[PDB]
Design an enzyme around this catalytic site. Structure first.
Site, PDB file in Angstrom:
ATOM      1  CB  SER A   1      -0.862   0.043   1.228  1.00 11.59           C
ATOM      2  OG  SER A   1      -1.592   1.203   1.079  1.00 11.59           O
ATOM      3  N   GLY A   2       0.714   2.220  -0.757  1.00  5.49           N
ATOM      4  CA  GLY A   2       1.314   3.237  -0.920  1.00  5.49           C
ATOM      5  C   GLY A   2       2.701   3.198  -1.640  1.00  5.49           C
TER       6      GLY A   2
ATOM      7  CB  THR B   1      -2.862   3.260  -8.127  1.00  2.00           C
ATOM      8  OG1 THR B   1      -3.491   2.253  -7.481  1.00  2.00           O
ATOM      9  CG2 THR B   1      -4.102   4.348  -8.728  1.00  2.00           C
TER      10      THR B   1
ATOM     11  CG  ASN C   1      -1.873   5.656  -0.923  1.00  2.00           C
ATOM     12  OD1 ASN C   1      -1.880   6.858  -1.120  1.00  2.00           O
ATOM     13  ND2 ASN C   1      -1.884   4.957  -1.800  1.00  2.00           N
TER      14      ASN C   1
ATOM     15  CB  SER D   1      -5.353   3.363   0.263  1.00  3.80           C
ATOM     16  OG  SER D   1      -5.319   2.008   0.278  1.00  3.80           O
ATOM     17  CB  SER D   2      -6.248   0.897  -4.816  1.00  2.00           C
ATOM     18  OG  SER D   2      -5.699   1.831  -5.734  1.00  2.00           O
TER      19      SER D   2
ATOM     20  N   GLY E   1       0.336  -6.532  -3.033  1.00  2.00           N
ATOM     21  CA  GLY E   1       1.253  -7.780  -2.996  1.00  2.00           C
ATOM     22  C   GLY E   1       0.979  -8.231  -1.666  1.00  2.00           C
TER      23      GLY E   1
ATOM     24  CD  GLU F   1      -3.901  -6.444   2.433  1.00  2.00           C
ATOM     25  OE1 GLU F   1      -4.572  -6.928   3.039  1.00  2.00           O
ATOM     26  OE2 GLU F   1      -3.774  -5.344   2.208  1.00  2.00           O
TER      27      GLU F   1
HETATM   28  N1  LIG Z   1       6.235   8.089  -9.535  1.00  2.38           N
HETATM   29  C1  LIG Z   1       5.582   8.719  -8.584  1.00  2.38           C
HETATM   30  N2  LIG Z   1       5.683   9.876  -8.602  1.00  2.38           N
HETATM   31  C2  LIG Z   1       5.231  10.738  -7.744  1.00  2.38           C
HETATM   32  N3  LIG Z   1       4.521  10.302  -6.713  1.00  2.38           N
HETATM   33  C3  LIG Z   1       4.145   8.998  -6.790  1.00  2.38           C
HETATM   34  C4  LIG Z   1       4.761   8.307  -7.534  1.00  2.38           C
HETATM   35  N4  LIG Z   1       4.413   6.917  -6.992  1.00  2.38           N
HETATM   36  C5  LIG Z   1       3.788   7.033  -6.089  1.00  2.38           C
HETATM   37  N5  LIG Z   1       3.386   8.444  -5.750  1.00  2.38           N
HETATM   38  C6  LIG Z   1       2.751   9.032  -4.798  1.00  2.38           C
HETATM   39  O1  LIG Z   1       2.547   8.282  -3.653  1.00  2.38           O
HETATM   40  C7  LIG Z   1       1.106   8.111  -3.188  1.00  2.38           C
HETATM   41  C8  LIG Z   1       0.974   6.748  -3.242  1.00  2.38           C
HETATM   42  O2  LIG Z   1       1.111   6.121  -4.355  1.00  2.38           O
HETATM   43  P1  LIG Z   1      -0.160   5.035  -5.080  1.00  2.38           P
HETATM   44  O3  LIG Z   1      -0.064   4.875  -6.741  1.00  2.38           O
HETATM   45  O4  LIG Z   1      -1.485   5.446  -4.766  1.00  2.38           O
HETATM   46  O5  LIG Z   1       0.166   3.652  -4.379  1.00  2.38           O
HETATM   47  P2  LIG Z   1      -0.331   2.274  -4.294  1.00  2.38           P
HETATM   48  O6  LIG Z   1      -1.347   2.111  -5.211  1.00  2.38           O
HETATM   49  O7  LIG Z   1       0.757   1.215  -4.585  1.00  2.38           O
HETATM   50  O8  LIG Z   1      -1.138   1.971  -3.123  1.00  2.38           O
HETATM   51  C9  LIG Z   1       0.559   8.857  -4.411  1.00  2.38           C
HETATM   52  O9  LIG Z   1      -0.685   9.311  -4.111  1.00  2.38           O
HETATM   53  C10 LIG Z   1       1.672   9.688  -4.898  1.00  2.38           C
HETATM   54  O10 LIG Z   1       1.693  10.890  -3.873  1.00  2.38           O
HETATM   55  F1  BEF Z   2      -2.354  -0.445  -2.387  1.00  2.00           F
HETATM   56 BE1  BEF Z   2      -2.384   1.545  -2.434  1.00  2.00          BE
HETATM   57  F2  BEF Z   2      -2.804   1.866  -1.054  1.00  2.00           F
HETATM   58  F3  BEF Z   2      -3.401   1.508  -3.261  1.00  2.00           F
HETATM   59 MG   LIG Z   3      -3.681   1.856  -5.389  1.00  2.36          MG
END
Ligand SMILES: Nc1ncnc2c1ncn2[C@@H]1O[C@H](COP(=O)(O)OP(=O)(O)O)[C@@H](O)[C@H]1O
Ligand code: BEF
Ligand SMILES: [Mg+2]
Length: 743
Positions: A180-181, A185, A229, A232-233, A453, A455
Site C-alpha cells: 500500500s502506498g 496505481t 496512503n 489508497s485503492s 502484493g 499483506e
Molecule cells: N512516480 C511517482 N511520482 C510521484 N508520486 C508518486 C509516484 N508513485 C507514487 N506516488 C505517490 O505516492 C502516493 C501513493 O501512490 P499510489 O499509486 O496510490 O500507491 P499504491 O496504489 O501502490 O497503494 C501517491 O498518491 C503519490 O503521492
Molecule cells: F495499495 Be495502495 F494503497 F492503493
Molecule cells: Mg492503488
C-alpha cells in the site's frame, strides 16, 4: 535526439550523468571492499569495509571504527567495482548479494532515478515528490525504443508490451504489485496515458478520453485515505486495453476485486471513509444539499468517528468537480448521477439511525428523522423500511415469522444493508463503464493488473487470506515464466513446487483445504467461529507442514506463505463468507421509485453472487484471471515503498530489503546468481577491455576472437565463462575481477 543530447531533460532526469571521458583508467582503484553488518542483530544494516589481507579461505577487513575483522570468503558480501554503481539493470552486477543490490538501488535513488530493471522485473521506488518524467515529450522519446536503448521507465515497459503485441500478434499483460502506498496505481495510470497516446486515433478522440476518465470515477468510490496512503485503492483491478488489428485502441474493460465494504461503516483512527462522501458534502450545490438533507461530515456517524475529515493539500470540493466531469465524459446522465448521489446520501442517513430499547429487549425508533431522510432519497416506504430493519420475517422452515430484534441486531442489520448498497452500487458503476467502453469484437489486448502484493499485518483476517492466496498464485506464475524465459535464453545462445503445497492447503478440494472447510461450515446457521477453527486444527494441526496451530491462542492459525508465516484470526469469518442480508430488506428496496436503486436489487448480475459463498466466488474470479493471464506474454513491475513515513529522500534499508525479499526480487537474483548472471555482447566487452591484453584493438570484426584474446591474456578459468553465439556468459564475481585487472 534527446536521447543523445546530454543536455536534455531526458538526460538530466533519467540518466546517470556522463562526463567527458569514458576511459577505463578513470575508475581505477587500489582498494577492495566488503559489505558488512556493524551490528549482527541488525542484518539489513551494512557498512563498507575495506579489505586488508586474505588467507587462502577468509578475508580480513577494516571496519568503519578502524577495527579489524574476518570473514570466510564463501560468506563474504563483496562490493562491486565502482563502475557498477548506478547500472540500469541489477543483472549487470558481478557480485549479486543483498547489500550489493540494495546499494545499486540506493545510488540510483540518490540521483532521483526511481526506475531500475532487475532481469525480468522493472523495480519502481516511490519518490514521494514530483519528478517531471511523464510529459508528452517523455512519451515521444520512448515510442519504438528497445529496452536497452532507453533508460528504465514505466513508459518503456509499456512500449515493449505494445510492440510485442503487434509483432507477435499475442496478447500481453502488465502486473503491477507491491505494498500500500508503493506507487502501483500511479504507475498504472501512466501505462494507460502512454497507451492512449501511442495508439490513440487523435487529430486534435472520444474513446480515448472516456478511457482516461474511467479511473477517476472509480477512485472516488473505491479509494480512501488510510494511514499508509492518502489515496489508497480499497479494491483490486484488472484493466484490459483493447486494440484492433491495426494496433489502435478500440475499447476497454475493467474487472474489480474485493472492495473493502466494511470501511463504509467503520474507519480506523485518523483514516477516512471513501472519498465520494467528502466530495459530495463539499461540492453539492446549495440546492443539492437541501434536496439531499445534506450537512457536514461531523453531523454523520459514518464520517465523524475517525477524527479525520480532510486530506492535506486536497480539496474535496475541487475533487467533486473532477469526479462529476468524468461521469459526464463517460456517459452518465444527469439523472443517473443524481440517483448515485441520493444513494450516497441515503447511506449517510441510514448511518444516523439510532435504535433505542426499553420496551423489553426489542428495538425502537423513537426518533424518526434520519429514517425519513433515507426513505425519501431511496424512494422507499419508510414504514416498510422500519419493519424490515427491526422486524424481519424469518423462516422457521414451515413458519414465516417476523422476529423482533434488539438494538444490536437491529444496528448490525442496518450496517449489512449499507454495505450491500455500497458494494452493489460499485459493481453497477463498473458495469456501466464497461457498457460504454467494452468492445465485444477486439482483436488484441494489453491487460494491466493493479493489486496489492502480500499483506502481513498485526491482525490478519479473511480479506488478507484472499490477498495472500492471490499472491501465492501470481508468484507461482512468475516463477514458471522466468523458468521458461531463462531456459529459452540459454538455448538461443547455445550454452549448457513449494508454491503448490500452500496453494492446495488453501483451495484444495480433496483433501479439503481451508476454503472448502469454511464453505462447509457455511450451511449451518448455528455454526460458530470456534466450530470452524476446531475443524481447521482437526484437519491440519501436525498434519500439514504449511499449517501451525498456535501454542496459546484459540482464535488464530498460521499459514507459511511464500513471504513467510502469516497468522490469521478467525473472528467473523462465517459472516464474511455468507455476507447475509435480510430478505425483507431486499423486498423493501425492490420497490424503489428510484431507477438505479431498483437495478441494484433487480438485476441478478448485481444483486446475487451466482448459491455461492464469498470465498467460492473469489476463487472463481481468480481462476478466470489466471486463465487469461496464462494466454498473455507477461511483464512484471514491482513497486517499492522507500519508508513508512511518506517522505522523500529517505530510503530506509530494512524497509526496502524486507520488501525485496517478499516480492520475489531477491530470489530471482539468487536463482540467476547461481548460473551465468552476466551475458555481455562480444563487441561491447572488447570496447572496454581491449586495453587489458597486449594484443587486441578496441574495434574488431572477430569480437569473439578478440574476447577470447583477453580472457587468455588474463589467464581466466574456462569454467568462469561460456561462449555464446552473441554473448559471452560470465559466472558471478568474474566480471568484477576482470574490471579489477590492470592496463
Ligand atoms: N512516480 C511517482 N511520482 C510521484 N508520486 C508518486 C509516484 N508513485 C507514487 N506516488 C505517490 O505516492 C502516493 C501513493 O501512490 P499510489 O499509486 O496510490 O500507491 P499504491 O496504489 O501502490 O497503494 C501517491 O498518491 C503519490 O503521492
Ligand atoms: F495499495 Be495502495 F494503497 F492503493
Ligand atoms: Mg492503488
Amino acid at each position: 535526439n534527446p536521447i543523445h543530447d546530454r543536455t536534455s531533460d531526458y538526460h538530466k532526469y533519467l540518466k546517470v550523468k556522463q562526463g567527458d571521458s569514458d576511459l577505463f583508467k578513470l575508475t581505477v582503484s587500489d582498494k577492495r571492499y566488503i559489505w558488512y553488518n556493524p551490528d549482527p542483530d541488525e542484518r539489513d544494516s551494512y557498512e563498507c569495509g575495506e579489505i586488508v589481507s586474505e588467507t587462502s579461505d577468509s578475508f580480513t577487513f577494516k571496519t568503519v571504527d578502524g577495527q579489524d575483522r574476518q570473514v570466510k570468503k564463501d560468506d563474504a558480501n563483496q562490493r562491486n567495482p565502482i563502475k557498477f554503481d548506478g547500472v540500469e539493470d541489477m543483472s549487470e552486477l558481478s557480485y549479486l548479494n543483498e547489500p550489493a543490490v540494495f546499494h545499486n538501488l540506493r545510488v540510483r535513488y540518490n540521483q532521483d532515478l526511481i526506475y531500475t530493471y532487475s532481469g525480468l522485473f522493472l523495480v519502481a521506488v516511490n519518490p514521494f515528490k514530483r519528478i517531471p518524467i511523464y510529459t508528452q515529450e517523455m512519451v515521444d522519446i520512448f515510442k519504438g525504443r528497445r529496452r536497452n536503448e532507453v533508460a528504465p521507465h514505466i513508459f518503456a515497459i509499456s512500449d515493449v508490451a505494445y510492440r510485442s503485441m503487434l509483432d507477435d500478434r499475442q496478447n500481453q499483460s502488465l502486473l503491477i504489485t507491491g505494498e500500500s502506498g508503493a506507487g502501483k496505481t500511479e504507475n498504472t495510470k501512466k501505462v494507460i496515458q502512454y497507451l492512449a497516446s501511442v495508439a490513440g486515433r487523435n487529430q486534435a478522440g472520444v474513446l480515448e478520453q472516456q478511457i482516461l476518465q474511467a479511473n477517476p470515477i472509480l477512485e472516488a468510490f473505491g479509494n480512501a485515505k488510510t494511514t499508509r496512503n492518502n489515496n489508497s485503492s480499497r479494491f483490486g483491478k484488472f484493466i484490459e486495453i483493447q486494440f484492433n488489428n491495426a494496433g489502435f485502441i478500440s475499447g476497454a474493460s475493467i474487472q474489480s476485486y474485493l472492495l473493502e465494504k466494511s470501511r463504509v461503516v467503520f474507519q480506523s483512527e485518523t483514516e477516512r471513509n471513501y472519498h465520494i462522501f467528502y466530495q459530495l458534502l463539499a461540492g453539492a450545490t446549495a440546492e443539492e444539499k437541501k434536496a439531499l438533507h445534506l450537512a457536514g461530515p461531523e453531523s454523520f456517524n459514518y464520517l465523524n468517528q475517525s477524527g479525520c475529515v480532510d486530506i492535506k493539500g486536497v480539496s474535496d470540493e475541487d475533487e467533486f468537480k473532477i469526479t462529476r466531469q468524468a461521469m459526464d465524459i463517460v456517459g452518465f446522465s444527469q439523472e443517473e448521477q443524481m440517483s448515485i448521489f441520493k444513494i450516497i446520501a441515503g447511506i449517510l442517513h441510514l448511518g444516523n439511525i439510532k435504535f433505542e430499547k426499553g420496551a423489553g429487549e426489542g428495538a425502537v425508533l423513537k426518533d424518526k428523522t434520519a429514517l425519513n431522510a433515507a426513505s425519501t432519497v431511496f424512494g422507499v416506504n419508510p414504514s416498510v423500511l422500519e419493519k424490515a430493519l427491526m422486524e424481519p420475517r424469518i423462516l422457521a422452515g414451515r413458519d414465516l415469522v417476523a422476529q423482533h430484534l434488539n438494538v444490536e441486531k437491529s444496528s448490525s442489520s442496518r450496517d449489512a444493508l449499507v454495505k450491500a448498497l455500497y458494494g452493489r452500487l460499485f459493481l453497477w458503476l463498473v458495469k456501466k463503464i464497461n457498457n460504454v467502453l467494452c468492445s465485444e469484437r477486439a482483436a488484441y489486448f494489453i491487460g494491466v493488473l493493479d493489486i496489492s502484493g502480500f499483506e502481513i499485518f498485526k491482525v490478519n483476517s479473511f480479506e488478507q487470506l484472499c490477498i495472500n492466496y492471490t499472491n501465492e498464485k501470481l508468484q507461482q506464475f512468475f516463477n514458471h515464466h522466468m523458468f521458461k524465459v531463462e531456459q529459452e535464453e540459454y538455448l538461443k545462445e547455445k550454452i549448457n513446487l513449494d508454491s503448490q503445497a500452500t496453494i492446495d492447503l488453501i483451495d484444495g478440494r480433496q483433501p479439503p483445504g481451508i476454503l472448502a472447510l469454511l464453505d462447509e461450515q457455511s450451511v449451518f446457521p448455528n455454526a460458530t467461529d470456534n466450530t470452524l477453527i476446531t475443524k481447521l486444527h482437526s484437519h491440519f494441526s501436525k498434519k500439514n507442514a504449511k499449517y501451525e496451530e498456535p501454542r496459546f491462542s484459540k482464535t488464530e492459525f498460521g499459514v507459511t506463505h511464500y513471504a513467510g508465516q502469516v497468522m490469521y484470526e478467525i473472528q467473523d469469518w462465517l459472516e464474511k463468507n455468507k455476507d447475509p442480508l435480510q430478505q425483507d430488506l431486499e423486498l423493501c428496496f425492490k420497490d424503489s421509485s428510484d431507477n438505479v436503486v431498483t437495478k441494484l436489487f433487480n438485476d441478478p448480475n448485481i444483486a446475487s453472487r451466482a448459491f455461492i459463498t464469498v470465498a467460492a466466488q473469489y476463487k472463481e474470479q481468480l481462476a478466470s484471471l489466471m486463465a487469461t493471464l496464462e494466454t498473455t506474454n507477461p511483464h512484471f513491475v514491482r513497486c517499492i515503498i522507500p519508508n513508512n513515513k511518506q517522505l522523500p529522500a529517505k530510503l530506509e534499508d530494512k524497509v526496502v530489503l524486507d520488501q525485496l525479499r517478499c516480492n520475489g526480487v531477491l530470489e530471482g537474483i539468487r536463482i540467476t546468481r547461481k548460473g551465468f548472471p552476466n551475458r555481455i555482447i562480444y563487441a561491447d566487452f572488447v570496447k572496454r577491455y581491449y586495453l587489458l591484453a597486449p594484443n587486441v584493438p578496441r574495434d574488431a570484426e572477430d569480437s569473439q576472437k578478440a574476447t577470447d584474446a583477453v580472457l587468455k591474456h588474463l589467464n581466466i578459468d574456462p569454467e568462469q565463462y561460456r561462449f555464446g553465439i552473441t554473448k559471452i556468459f560470465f559466472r558471478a564475481g568474474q566480471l568484477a575481477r576482470i574490471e579489477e585487472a590492470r592496463e
